[PDB]
Amino acid sequence: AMVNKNKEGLNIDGKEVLAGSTNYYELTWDLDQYKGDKSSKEAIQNGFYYVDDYPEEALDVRPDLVKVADEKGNQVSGVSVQQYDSLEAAPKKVQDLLKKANITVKGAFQLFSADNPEEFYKQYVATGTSLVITDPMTVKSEFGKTGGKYENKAYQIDFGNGYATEVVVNNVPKITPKKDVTVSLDPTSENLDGQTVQLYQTFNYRLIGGLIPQNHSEELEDYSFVDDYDQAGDQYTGNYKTFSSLNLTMKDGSVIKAGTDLTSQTTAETDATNGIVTVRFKEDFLQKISLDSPFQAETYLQMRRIAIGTFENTYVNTVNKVAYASNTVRTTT
Numbered sequence: 001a002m003v004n005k006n007k008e009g010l011n012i013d014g015k016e017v018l019a020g021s022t023n024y025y026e027l028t029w030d031l032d033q034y035k036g037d038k039s040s041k042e043a044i045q046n047g048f049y050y051v052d053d054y055p056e057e058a059l060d061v062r063p064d065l066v067k068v069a070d071e072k073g074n075q076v077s078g079v080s081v082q083q084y085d086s087l088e089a090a091p092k093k094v095q096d097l098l099k100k101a102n103i104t105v106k107g108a109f110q111l112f113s114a115d116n117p118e119e120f121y122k123q124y125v126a127t128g129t130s131l132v133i134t135d136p137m138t139v140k141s142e143f144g145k146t147g148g149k150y151e152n153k154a155y156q157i158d159f160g161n162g163y164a165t166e167v168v169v170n171n172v173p174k175i176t177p178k179k180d181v182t183v184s185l186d187p188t189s190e191n192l193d194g195q196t197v198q199l200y201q202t203f204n205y206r207l208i209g210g211l212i213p214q215n216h217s218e219e220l221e222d223y224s225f226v227d228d229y230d231q232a233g234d235q236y237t238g239n240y241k242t243f244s245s246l247n248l249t250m251k252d253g254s255v256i257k258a259g260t261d262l263t264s265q266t267t268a269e270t271d272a273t274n275g276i277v278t279v280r281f282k283e284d285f286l287q288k289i290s291l292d293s294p295f296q297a298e299t300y301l302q303m304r305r306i307a308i309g310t311f312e313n314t315y316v317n318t319v320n321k322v323a324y325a326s327n328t329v330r331t332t333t
């Protein structure tokens, strides 16, 4: 058995996992088969190992969180974990172990081993004490821009033979903020990116957040719009509105329809010196969104064009404090 869980222990097999989130994998190390009639000599001679072929393209292991315990949570000492970048890179003894076990791995993997086979056998195997490996791995923050599926595979090795656990699959959503320029709050209004904005005119920067898909694995703690605008051409008026981009289902079962004004569920911080405005969703509002609901929102910053020339703007949508830059717009005055 292998399962993936979020930090609060919720099973998240098959779920969408945001860049920066952690997969708290739990691998079951089943020692039940030793209640059979093979000898301790056969068990100890072969040793006790577990292999995790983790998806190194998507995930970074958190070795500081790797732990081995029994089913009651008693921590188990004497199990070591070694990470290897590839099979070729691993020592001959490890290569041979996997070969004999009928295992192949893709790229990097981890090997868990009983440091002291005889004592492992006496204290854990012979007492019918199965173990639980906690093996957390974080989605690379970068990956959130390309997105894609990843798969974690594990194998237990007993009497020198490897047996696969289940494979757990997850997906990383591509988070792709977009920035438009408008003179209206209507979502169908014309995008002025690439066009002219007259001197002294009021206009909006439309900051469309990334789409958090339904069936996501972690609470939303942060969903912010950060806009360091060019003060040589633009002045933020101190007025903005934020709207839902989609229907949102809340944990209680209520629904906020697409296009609802969510400005009262946000706060804004403005830096007048540097020409930066940051609009954040209130944490208590984000907590109300169901994990099964998609989430997306957009913010219209009301601006004034205060000088002639060509000016660009880009914004950053942070999602659980991970930054995703929008496209860069350009207007001429």
Ligand SMILES: [Ca+2]
Pocket (backbone or CB within 6 Å): 053, 054, 055, 056, 105, 106, 107, 108, 109
């Ligand atoms: Ca791998």
Ligand SMILES: [Ca+2]
Pocket (backbone or CB within 6 Å): 228, 229, 230, 231, 274, 275, 276
């Ligand atoms: Ca600025």
Ligand SMILES: [Mg+2]
Pocket (backbone or CB within 6 Å): 088, 089, 090, 091, 092
């Ligand atoms: Mg070598």
